[PDB]
Every structure is written in C-alpha cells, then in structure tokens.
Amino acid sequence: GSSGSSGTPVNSLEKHSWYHGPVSRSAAEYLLSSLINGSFLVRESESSPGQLSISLRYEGRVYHYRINTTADGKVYVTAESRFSTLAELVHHHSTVADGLVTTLHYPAPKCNKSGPSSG
C-alpha cells in the first residue's frame, strides 16, 4: 500500500504530462527506470539559461535530444523539418518519430488534464 497526494497553494507552470520542470540529469534517467520501455520526459537544466532536453527511455537506454534554437527563436530536434514551438515539437512527433528514436506516446504517468486553479 502507498498513498500520498494533497493540493498545494503554491503556483506552478508545469501542466504538460511530459514536462517535468527542472530535473537533474540523473533524476531523469532514474525516474525513467520507474516506467515502461516507452516513456519520454522533458527536463530543464539550471546552469544554462532555459536549457530543455527530451530524454526518452527505450530498450534500457536513454536517448538525449538537445533541443536546438534558430536565429529567430524556434525549437526543432531534427534535420528533416522544423517546428514553431515546443508543444508542436512533441505533439507532431508523438504521431511520427520523423527521426527521433520513437513516437512520443507516454510522456508521463498519472497524466492529469483537468486540475485545480492557480495564478
């Protein structure tokens, strides 16, 4: 038996299931171990200013995808095409790998769409 979940007053900007705010490189790899061989999460580094990365576990391996940046300010991890924003990067890919190791299907567990209010 294991229970533990209560609402907090503190405000947060981590809605997306895959998005897990700032997470230590290790934290990602480890946490992944607590999931199937088809989970993908998005961690964020502290040192570097706004440094995201998509690390999905597969066949006992963690594929890192350092999101690139264009002159303007777009994100896209591939050499076939480009994307406007991140949401589209993961959304579009979710359907087809288009280069990635696999198709982002399971971003994060206990995925919640409707939650409490906060601002």
Swiss-Prot record:
User: In this chain, where does the modification Phosphotyrosine occur?
Assistant: 19, 30, 63, 76, 106
Domain SH2, first and last residues per copy? 18-108
Tell me which domain of life the UniProt entry assigns to the organism this sequence originates from. Answer: Eukaryota
Q: How is it modified after translation?
A: Phosphorylated at Tyr-106 by ABL1 in response to oxidative stress. Phosphorylated by PDGFRB.
The record's subcellular locations are: Cytoplasm, Cytoskeleton
Known tissue expression: Widely expressed.
Q: What does this protein do?
A: Non-receptor tyrosine-protein kinase that plays an ABL1-overlapping role in key processes linked to cell growth and survival such as cytoskeleton remodeling in response to extracellular stimuli, cell motility and adhesion and receptor endocytosis. Coordinates actin remodeling through tyrosine phosphorylation of proteins controlling cytoskeleton dynamics like MYH10 (involved in movement); CTTN (involved in signaling); or TUBA1 and TUBB (microtubule subunits). Binds directly F-actin and regulates actin cytoskeletal structure through its F-actin-bundling activity.
Domain comment from the record reads as follows: Contains two distinct classes of F-actin-binding domains. Although both can bind F-actin, the 2 are required to bundle actin filaments.
**Quaternary form?**
Interacts with PSMA7. Interacts with CTTN. Found in a complex with ABL1, ABL2, CRK and UNC119; leading to the inhibition of CRK phosphorylation by ABL kinases.
Task: Give the family this protein belongs to, as stated in its UniProt record.
Answer: Belongs to the protein kinase superfamily. Tyr protein kinase family. ABL subfamily.
Its recorded name reads: Tyrosine-protein kinase ABL2
Recorded source organism is Homo sapiens
Q: What gene makes this protein?
A: ABL2
Q: Where the shown chain sits in the full protein?
A: 163 to 268 of 1182
